[PDB]
Write an enzyme that holds these catalytic residues in place. Structure first.
Site: not given
Length: 122
Positions: A43-44, A64-65, A85
């Site tokens: 989802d950017l 990260h996604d 993270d």
């Protein structure tokens, strides 16, 4: 999937610049990694906090996604969440080194806010 998938996934999700660089090349050549059946959906930064100064954090968000989705798919999310993270924070800080003065401080402040907004989950 190939036998080394767990190792490849680990290699794409380290905090180092080399891990990010390896992932960026794969991201541009996803089809070359088809054998691994990775989840390349993202989802950017659309689900992230505000970014008033418009720093280009989209690729940081995308990696990260990738980390979250694929470790959740492997059923080992809890133990890898922290590093993912942290890698996200490091990717954003790399963006910030391209700025000086106030902008550098504003960029690092936004990176910290983004990081804290995912750190709150655990």
């Amino acid at each position: 999937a190939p036998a080394d998938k767990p190792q490849v996934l680990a290699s794409f999700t380290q905090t180092s610049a080399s891990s990010q660089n390896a992932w960026l090349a794969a991201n541009r050549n996803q089809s070359a990694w088809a054998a691994y059946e990775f989840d390349w959906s993202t989802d950017l930064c659309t689900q992230a906090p505000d970014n008033p100064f418009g720093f280009p954090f989209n690729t940081a968000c995308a990696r990260h996604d990738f980390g979250y989705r694929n470790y959740k798919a492997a059923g080992s999310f809890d133990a890898n969440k922290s590093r993912i993270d942290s890698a996200f924070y490091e990717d954003m800080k790399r963006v910030c080194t391209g700025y000086t003065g106030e902008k550098n401080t504003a960029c690092n402040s936004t990176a910290w806010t983004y990081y804290q907004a995912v750190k709150i989950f655990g």
